[PDB]
Structure 1
Amino acid sequence: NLYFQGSLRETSEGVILSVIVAPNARETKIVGIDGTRGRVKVNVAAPPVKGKANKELMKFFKKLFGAEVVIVRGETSREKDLLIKGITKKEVIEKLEL
């Protein structure tokens, strides 16, 4: 029963997916929804240093969506916004709900 609608918006350029990362994880994976923040809780299998969590986060979502993913907010924050270029909200929700 995970509802992603409060963590996404569809813009001129694609979809902005809003996440909150928890680093130091055994496995990169979606774990739930932070309804206070409107963000997907994502465990990231990387330490919080040297950009490594950013690289792993983008690798994971590029594979999931089959689209280019860039960080547009939160490069050095836990609360990161990911622009998935050229995609619709319907397609993103379908892939997140896998």
Structure 2
Amino acid sequence: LYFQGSLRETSEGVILSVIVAPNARETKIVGIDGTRGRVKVNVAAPPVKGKANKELMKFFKKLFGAEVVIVRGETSREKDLLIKGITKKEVIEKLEL
């Protein structure tokens, strides 16, 4: 199981496909869902008032040093994040740290 199954590079940056679980002890990557092609991300925020979406974006903006926006799944557990202006190679390097 590699992170490459959860990423693709468009003209704008990298779309990182995640599957979240809120109410977690710590925001962190906890796995890879090999069937869905998504990174399993625990989010230390409640799923109310957009707080889990905010925490998710904050985590990845800090990790990648780039603006992160939700492009699909704002009200789903399965969310696609656009990491603007970054390459897939850079995203893989940072996910593997």
Q: TM class, shorter-chain normalised?
A: over 0.9
Question: 1:26 & 1:43 partners in 2: Cα distance?
Answer: 8
Q: Structure 2: 5+ residue runs without aligned partners?
A: none
Question: 2:47 & 2:8 partners in 1: Cα distance?
Answer: 26
- Measured against aligned partners, the alpha-carbon deviations of 1:32-76 in whole angstroms (never above 9, x if no partner) come to 000110000000001111100000000000000000000000000
1:65-84 → structure 2 map (5 Å cutoff): 65-84=64-83
Paired-residue identity, %: 100
Question: 2:36 & 2:6 partners in 1: Cα distance?
Answer: 8
Question: 1:45 & 1:18 partners in 2: Cα distance?
Answer: 18
What TM-score do you get using the length of structure 2 for normalisation?
0.98
Question: 1:24 & 1:68 partners in 2: Cα distance?
Answer: 24
What TM-score do you get using the length of structure 1 for normalisation?
0.97
Give secondary structure in 2 for the equivalent of 1:64.
helix
Question: 2:76 & 2:58 partners in 1: Cα distance?
Answer: 18
Give secondary structure in 1 for the equivalent of 2:8.
strand
Runs of 4+ in 1 over 2 A off after TM superposition: none
Asked if residue 43 in structure 1 is aligned to residue 18 in structure 2, the reply is no
Q: How big is the shift at 1:90?
A: 0.2
Q: Structure 1: 5+ residue runs without aligned partners?
A: none
Partner of 2:6 in structure 1? 7
